[PDB]
Each structure stands twice: as C-alpha cells, then as structure tokens.
Design a protein around this ligand. Structure first.
Ligand SMILES: [Mg+2]
Ligand SMILES: [Mg+2]
Ligand SMILES: [Mg+2]
Ligand SMILES: [Mg+2]
Ligand SMILES: [Mg+2]
Ligand SMILES: [Mg+2]
Ligand SMILES: [Mg+2]
Ligand SMILES: [Mg+2]
Ligand SMILES: [Mg+2]
Ligand SMILES: [Mg+2]
Ligand SMILES: [Mg+2]
Ligand SMILES: [Mg+2]
Ligand SMILES: [Mg+2]
Ligand SMILES: [Mg+2]
Ligand SMILES: [Mg+2]
Ligand SMILES: [Mg+2]
Ligand SMILES: [Mg+2]
Ligand SMILES: [Mg+2]
Ligand SMILES: [Mg+2]
Lengths: 80, 82, 123, 129, 150, 205
RNA sequence: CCCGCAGAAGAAGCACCGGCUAACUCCGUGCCAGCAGCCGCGGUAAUACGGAGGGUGCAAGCGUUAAUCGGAAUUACUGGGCGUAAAGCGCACGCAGGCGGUUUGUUAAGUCAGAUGUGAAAUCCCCGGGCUCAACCUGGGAACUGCAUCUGAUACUGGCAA
RNA sequence: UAGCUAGUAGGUGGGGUAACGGCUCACCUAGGCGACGAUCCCUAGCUGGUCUGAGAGGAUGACCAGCCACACUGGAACUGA
C-alpha cells in the first residue's frame, strides 16, 4: 500500500459517515513528558459494517464528501 | 517559457552575475529553478571568472528552456570542450 | 512544579510596564505647557524645583522636569520631553529637553553643555 | 504508590550506603536484575543475589573502598512522570567519562560506554558515579 | 611560587554603651600553583592587621585538589550556605573566565582554563568556600579505578 | 582617527616608555616620565583590578596608535582565529603595515613610520599601499618607493633602527630599502612588559 | 587608478572624574541655586551644585532618550521555590486526567536503528579567491540539530492475553 | 467565553466545475464539532530568517528571498491560457 493508519471507531451511527480515533504519543516540545494527541477522521465505509469500538485500518483517498478523504481498508476485532 | 539568464547579485560598480534557470516572468534576482553557473565580468586575467555547468544548461535547453543574448555569448566564448 | 502542572499551565513571563508612557516607545514627544509650576521635593531634600505640566501631542497630560538653572518657559510654550524621572518630585517622570522647540538652553553653561542645550560659546 | 521500583532501588542503595550498610534487599524483577548486573559488571557493588521463587528478592553487596563508599551518587534520570530517550549520538556521558549512565536499549540494559559502542540508543534509566 | 591574593575586605560594627565600635574583615586565598589551595578569614580592628591575620589562616586551612594538567577532569558543583557554584573543564582555548572572587581561588589553585559561574548569593565568604569544597569533592581522574577496577 | 596629542604624556600615565618620541635620545628623562602625568600625577593610585585591566590594554593601544574601534575589532578577530585569543591579538597587532614599516626601521616612531604609509611612500610586493592597517603576511616584501627614497627621515630612521634590538621574523636591506616579513612573529618575540590575558579579561566580561 | 603642482597649508569635538566606574584640586554657593542610572550629594573647608585648572574615556563622532535580549537560576525544560521570608485549598470523598507491584506470551504505536527523499537560495559558520586594506563582493564545503517513506531491532513505555 | 452547528454531518440522484467535493439542488438518514479548548472575544500577514543568549531559551518578522492577501470603500462579474 501507500501508507495507512489504524484506530478505534468511536462512531458508526451514520450512513457511511464513520469516524475513527487515532491516539498517538508525543514528546511535549518543551517539558519532555509524553502525552496523548488524538486525531479524529471522517472515513468512508460502504455497506456500513465497522461498528462502534472496532479497531480498523484506514487509507487516504481523494475527497469523497467535504470532510471525507479516507476510506477503510480492513477491520480488526469487534464486540470490544 | 522557462529561461536561462543572468541574475545580478554584484555590488554597486562591481557586478557579479549568478546565471540561472527560472520562470521567465519572475523578477531578475528572484525565484529560480536552479543555479547553473556564475559570471564575473570583472574576474580579470588572474584565474576563475565564468564557471558554467554546461551539462544541466544544455539539458534544460533541450528540456525546453531558452537562453539570454548574454548567456549564449558566454558559451561560444567558453568554447565548450577546450 | 510537576511536569503535568507545567504542561497544563506553562510558565509565563511577567510582561513589563514601562516607566514612561511617552506613548509608543518614543525617544521624546512634543507637548504644550499647561502650567509652569515649581513645587518642593521629598523627605531628605528641600528646594523649589521648576517643572511644568504638558499636554502631549498624543493627548497624555503629564508633568515633566525643567533641567538647568533658569528658564523662559510659560503657559503655551511648545516643548519637547524625554524619559527621565526625578526622585525627589514623586510623579515627575519626564524631563524637558532644554534647547528644543521654544525651550531655551541654560545661560552661560560651559560644562556638560550638550545636556542643557547650550551651543559652543565663541572661543 | 510503589510506582517507581527502580528509584526505590537506586535509593535503597544510596541510603544503605550512606549508612555504611553492607547488605541490601528488596523485591526483585527482571529489570532490577539487569541493572544490578551493570552495577556489578562496572563495579559499584560486590555482587548481587536473588533468593526465592514465589516472591523473588534481589540482594546486593555494597562495596566500600577507603572510609568512603564506592557509589558517590546514584540518581534516577528517566521516571514514570517524565520519561527520557536519547538517540545514540545524544547519549549522555557522566562525570566526563568517569562513572556511568545505565541505559536500556532494544538489545538489553547496558552502559553508555556500551550503547555508544553498540551504536544504538535507549531510555537512560539512571546515572551512577 | 608563594602566590596569594585577597578577595574581599569589609567593615563591620559591634555597638556598645559608647557607640559603634568598628573593625574589618579580610578573606583571602593562597595556592601553590599545582593543587593545594586554602582560604582564610580572620578579622581585626584595623585593615592591615586583618588582611594579614587572614593570609596566615589560609596557609594552614589548606586543602589539595586532584587536577588533570591545566584543568579539572570533569565538571563539578559546589554549594555552601547561600552560594551554589558551578565550574567546568573547558578544553581550554584561553579559559580562566569566572566570577572574579572564584577566579581567585582558581588561579592560585593552578587550574588554567575553566569556565565558572556563581548562582545564589555572591557572598564571597561562601563562594570561595563553596568552590573549595567544590574542587575538594572532585575525584581522581584515575582513582575512580581505585574505587572500581575492583 | 589618529591620537594627535602630546605623545609623552601617555607614557607617563601608562608608566613605561612607549617609543612615541622614539627618535634620538633614549631612556627618557628629557621629559619627566613617571611622577606627574598631571596636577596630582605624583599621588599613588591604589587602583582597582578594573584599573589595572584597563591600563594594560590602554598601554598596548597607545603603543600601536590604535583607537577603541579598531582595537576592539582586532580582539574580536583574535578570539575568532583558532588558538589563544591573547596571542593572536598580538599577532594581528604586529601584522600592521605601519608597524612592520617602523619595525624594519624605515621610520623613527611608529607614527612617522605611519605617515610614511599614508604618504604613498611604501609598497608591498610591488604596488603602493597607503593605508596604515594593511595586514602584512609571510613572504611579503615592503620597500620605500624610489620617489622619496633615501630622504632625510628614513636615513636616520634606518640608522637608529640597529640601535634597537633588531627584529627576527623579518629582513631589512637599507640599500634597496626593502624588507621581507619572513614569519608571523612568535609569542616569544617582543613583549615581556605587556600582559595580554589582562586585556583579554577586560574584553571578556 | 596613475602623474605633476602649492603649502602643515583647509580639517576636533563630546561625556565624564563621590561610590558602583577609568579620572582631584581650587573658587563660588550655602537644604539656596541645583545634581541625581542606583545609593544619595547641597546648612561655611562640597573631589557629588556652578565655574576654573588639571585629569580620565571616546573620537568625527560624543552624550541623552527610546527599544529588545543579557546579566535575571527574577516563570527555574535545561535551572527555583512553599514550617518561621511570597507560597499547602479548613477538611474529606471522588469523576475526568496523570501514575501504577509482579510473570510469560504476543503486539510494535511510543522508543531505538539503518536506508532513502526532502529540509529553496541568501543568511550564519569553516578554507579559500576579488576590490590598496577593510567594510563589501565572491568559489566551495560545512550546517540546516526538522520532516516523511521503507526496512529492521523489542530492553523500556503503550496495547492485547492469561 | 462551555457549549457550538439546518447545507449543519452523512447517504442517494440531477446539476455543476478544468477537476475531487454540500460546490449546488431535491429527497433520505440525524448526524457533525467540543474541555487534546469547540463556540465567542482580543490581537495578527506566515516563512527563510533577524537581534540576543555558553546553551536552552527570549524577543522580533525593516532592508534580501519565498508564500499569501489587498489596490479609495462595498459588491459584481466580463474578456482571457
Ligand atoms: Mg515496571
Ligand atoms: Mg572559622
Ligand atoms: Mg571611524
Ligand atoms: Mg576610581
Ligand atoms: Mg553631572
Ligand atoms: Mg567651598
Ligand atoms: Mg532567564
Ligand atoms: Mg526563589
Ligand atoms: Mg508566610
Ligand atoms: Mg492543611
Ligand atoms: Mg539553505
Ligand atoms: Mg584581501
Ligand atoms: Mg509490555
Ligand atoms: Mg452527486
Ligand atoms: Mg493587521
Ligand atoms: Mg545565561
Ligand atoms: Mg522595497
Ligand atoms: Mg473589489
Ligand atoms: Mg473564461
């Protein structure tokens, strides 16, 4: 592939309007401590299947909707 | 059209040109694509004064670029090979 | 203390008030003389210090010191003022540039003439 | 509350030392061990020992040279609150070379002297001189 | 190679029925030029008396420090009362830049090329002192091996 | 630019000869050196460290006839140039043409030797260099221009030039009136009575 | 840029000198006049006011004002503090958050490694070269301590399992 | 300043653009954003870099170069690559 991310779902409840979380860890640029910098993304999933709490793999595509530039590629785990 | 030309970074009454490939419409001493030589018109007999990367130049030229009246003059003066 | 703490609320650097609202960082400002006073100084000292209140080009109406010995300066005199408190006259925070606009230079000064705007006497 | 074991070591030492105490015990762990190692290897203590199975128990023998102790200063460097990671070219060197800095790399818990040689980096556990 | 210098002389007052009786204090540093440096304090009703009564104190009260040629081996921190001092090897270009007052102890000591600064109070009697203990705690660029090797 | 005032006054305050009347007589007197640079010149200045630190660099400065601007910049340069600030200072300070001129004896005083430069009557490797601070370097060759060669001053100049210790890093002629800067004067050449690391301390804080 | 010409001829001023801070005397004045970056000088011997002579520092500039950083470890990440000096909420419980004993496996996000691309030129720095020197101009390196992709490593941290 | 949001968030189709696209429309879903700071308020062109500092930092964005924006003020399009 050309790059891809994962992250837990967080919201399935809308017609292919799947939104995914992406936690990271980063050195605070000033005080060292590592801290969590989350990223939410509006990703397309056709035929709605990814479910709230599902870890999932994601790729970056052209603009689907205003907001959407990412489609899923695979799923990973469920029933959290 | 892209062009090779003399950008002029000299100094009052002691000019010293940086020959450069760029977008013909940009400012003389402004945005360029790459430097491909330099031409010291004071140079003098001593040594250096017109180093000119002929390999890129005549690659751009073929690539599509064009050349100044006063650059092509440096080339049929540099001779080319010897 | 804690790295969390500092992370949550970073360290902030006390910003500095001036001591001379000659507005916007100005070397000096022009003003007109509202009053030409001479009040007396604080504790240890005792004297009759010449001063003046000045409406400044930028609105501010402030009191400034008139340096030297003697001066023709009155109401409606157009002067120039610079930074420089006078600890003796609390609340006086500016000095008048002797020898500027309508301000005379100190008469007969031979030493330190450039302060107290005095021209080089004819040798 | 016992949220940093390694500082509890670094310190059980530090104190016991300043108390001219010969022995020193504590609950053990793989990580505790690997350090006791470098401390022995590099020679800041006589030798360690783990006695038990259910509830393992690190035991360290303190060195004393002259009147003094051999460990002049044992100090945590990384820690739960604020973790540290230097690359290879940015690994620290304690006391200008003398004494050392423990560091954990992907290839085990070594010294700075080591990790520099090993050409890699890690989390600088603590300093010891 | 006697090499000595006083760092600070000061006046103090005692206050008695009849008024303030004054006096002075000198604080001095003597060093051989090859390790071995001591400071002395000593006070006396008049200045010469004290500055001298001091120089002596220093001749006794003298420590010695394991140099490494012109410099220290590693960097060291010292800290007495309200002075926290820090000085550093510094692969000499010139060196000997430091807070004149610990420049004193440093040159008589024989270090030739260090950088230092003093934090906290620059109270002389506690910097020159903080630094002495500083240099003092310093240790054998070899005989850490003494400690170890074993 | 140039100091221009009473020359001896300086030496007297600086406490040592600076060779500003360099000419004829020697070991001053015929002057009054020491005990009265002024009205209170006699009095002993129990002067501070800053005092001594100031007067050393002031001394070196009154020596080469150099103002604060240039001097500060020599220092700046020295410090940059690898290896001991305080020495390079002196190196630079000797690489001065006007100095090399006086040093080769073409001028009685450093000043005179300078006026010579200013008056296009000197030539490095051939061409005229009329600017006092021109930096002279190894193998360079300075010669009086024929135009005004063997003229009053320079004769006597080259004369009592031998009265002096006579340098080392260079090579006079006195016939062709040329001289070759052989090598950058080592530390050990010159000095003793000048203590750099002070004027280093001065310009170090 | 070069050559001749005349005559030293046309070319020095500003701040300071009580301490911090390099530089001291006299005269005037007398809590007045006035000084003052800070401390503080002035009521009859003022090195602190004003003038003078002398001196110190700068010099075609010199001072004054304004302005940023510095020293200031005086917002302390490097690098600080809270018993009596500024500073522990009157006390508890606890959500979020932060942190978390110990073992094995797996994970490989943090972390670490390497490779690759990229990080405009100028600038800064190093060695040069060019203007009488210099400022200035200029060849070439170095540096851009960053970012991103791929591949690795798995001690530590994170996830997962027991 | 603790809530904000109706083309708002997403879907389906037509339209549309040089092009992907709530860009537009109709219909459907009830979504979307937010204490890792939304919304609101105040200030502001960003950068390479500049000055300072041993550094880390602090301060700053004239002159040179890059990007953006504006052209008396608000609005609009026409011509044209
Ligand atoms: Mg653990
Ligand atoms: Mg005692
Ligand atoms: Mg000048
Ligand atoms: Mg003095
Ligand atoms: Mg004055
Ligand atoms: Mg009197
Ligand atoms: Mg600071
Ligand atoms: Mg404090
Ligand atoms: Mg209290
Ligand atoms: Mg309480
Ligand atoms: Mg660049
Ligand atoms: Mg040159
Ligand atoms: Mg784990
Ligand atoms: Mg559509
Ligand atoms: Mg604006
Ligand atoms: Mg600092
Ligand atoms: Mg312009
Ligand atoms: Mg319009
Ligand atoms: Mg059209």
């Amino acid at each position: 592939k050309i790059r891809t991310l994962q992250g837990r779902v967080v919201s399935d409840k809308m017609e292919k309007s799947i939104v995914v979380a992406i936690e990271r860890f980063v050195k605070h640029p000033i005080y060292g401590k590592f801290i969590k910098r989350t990223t939410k993304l509006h990703v397309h999933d056709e035929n709605n299947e990814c479910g709230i709490g599902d870890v999932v793999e994601i790729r970056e595509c052209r603009p689907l909707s205003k907001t959407k530039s990412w489609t899923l590629v695979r799923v990973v785990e469920k029933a959290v | 059209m892209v062009t090779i030309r003399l950008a002029r970074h000299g100094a009052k009454k002691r000019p010293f040109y940086q020959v450069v490939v760029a977008d013909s419409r940009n400012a003389r001493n402004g945005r360029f694509i790459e430097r491909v030589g330099f031409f010291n018109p004071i140079a003098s007999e001593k040594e250096e004064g017109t180093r000119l990367d002929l390999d890129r130049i005549a690659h751009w030229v073929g690539q599509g670029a064009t050349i100044s009246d006063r650059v092509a003059a440096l080339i049929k003066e540099v001779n080319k090979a010897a | 203390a804690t790295v969390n703490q500092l992370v949550r609320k970073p360290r902030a650097r006390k910003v500095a008030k001036s001591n001379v609202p000659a507005l916007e960082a100005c070397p000096q400002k022009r003003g007109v003389c509202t009053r030409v006073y001479t009040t007396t100084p604080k504790k240890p000292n005792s004297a009759l210090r010449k001063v003046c209140r000045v409406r400044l080009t930028n609105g501010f109406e402030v009191t400034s010191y008139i340096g030297g010995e003697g001066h023709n300066l009155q109401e409606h005199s157009v002067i120039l003022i610079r930074g420089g408190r006078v600890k003796d006259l609390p609340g006086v925070r500016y000095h008048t540039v002797r020898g500027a606009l309508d301000c005379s230079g100190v008469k007969d000064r031979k030493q330190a003439r450039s302060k107290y705007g005095v021209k080089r006497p004819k040798a | 509350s016992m949220q940093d074991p390694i500082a509890d070591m670094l310190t059980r030492i530090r104190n016991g030392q300043a108390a001219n105490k010969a022995a020193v015990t504590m609950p053990s762990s793989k990580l505790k061990v690997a350090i006791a190692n470098v401390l022995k290897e590099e020679g800041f203590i006589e030798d360690f020992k783990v006695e038990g199975d259910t509830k393992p128990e690190l035991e360290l023998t303190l060195k004393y040279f002259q009147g003094k102790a051999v460990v002049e200063s044992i100090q945590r460097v990384s820690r739960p609150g604020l973790r540290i990671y230097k690359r290879k070219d940015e690994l620290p060197k304690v006391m200008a070379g003398l004494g050392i800095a423990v560091v954990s790399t992907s290839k085990g818990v070594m010294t700075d002297r080591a990790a520099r040689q090993a050409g890699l980096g890690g989390e600088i556990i603590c300093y010891v001189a | 190679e006697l090499q000595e210098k006083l760092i600070a002389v000061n006046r103090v007052s005692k206050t008695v029925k009849g008024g303030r009786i004054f006096s002075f204090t000198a604080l001095t540093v003597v060093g051989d030029g090859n390790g071995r440096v001591g400071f002395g304090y000593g006070k006396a009703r008049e200045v010469p008396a004290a500055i001298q009564k001091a120089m002596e104190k220093a001749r006794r009260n003298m420590i010695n420090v394991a140099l490494n040629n012109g410099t220290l081996q590693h960097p060291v921190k010292g800290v007495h009362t309200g002075s926290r001092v820090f000085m550093q090897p510094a692969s000499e270009g010139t060196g000997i830049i430091a807070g004149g007052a610990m420049r004193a102890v440093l040159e008589v000591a024989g270090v030739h090329n260090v950088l230092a600064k003093a934090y906290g109070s620059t109270n002389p009697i506690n910097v020159v002192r903080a630094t002495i203990d500083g240099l003092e705690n310093m240790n054998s660029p070899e005989m850490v091996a003494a400690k170890r090797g074993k | 630019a140039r100091y221009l005032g009473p020359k001896l006054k300086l030496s007297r305050r600086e406490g040592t000869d600076l060779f500003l009347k360099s000419g004829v007589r020697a070991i001053d007197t015929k002057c009054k050196i020491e005990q009265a640079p002024g009205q209170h010149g006699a009095r002993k200045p129990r002067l501070s460290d800053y005092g001594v630190q100031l007067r050393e660099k002031q001394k070196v400065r009154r020596i080469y006839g150099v103002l604060e601007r240039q001097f500060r910049n020599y220092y700046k340069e020295a410090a940059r140039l690898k290896g001991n600030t305080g020495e390079n200072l002196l190196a630079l300070l000797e690489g001065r043409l006007d100095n090399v001129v006086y040093r080769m004896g073409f001028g009685a005083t450093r000043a005179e030797a300078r006026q010579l430069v200013s008056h296009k009557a000197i030539m490095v490797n051939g061409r005229v260099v009329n600017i006092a601070s021109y930096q002279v370097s190894p193998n360079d060759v300075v010669s009086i221009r024929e135009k005004a060669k063997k003229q009053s001053r320079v004769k006597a100049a080259l004369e009592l030039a031998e009265q002096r210790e006579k340098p080392t890093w260079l090579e006079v002629d006195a016939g062709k009136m040329e001289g070759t800067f052989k090598r950058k004067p080592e530390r050990s050449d010159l000095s003793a009575d000048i203590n750099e690391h002070l004027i280093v301390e001065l310009y170090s804080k």
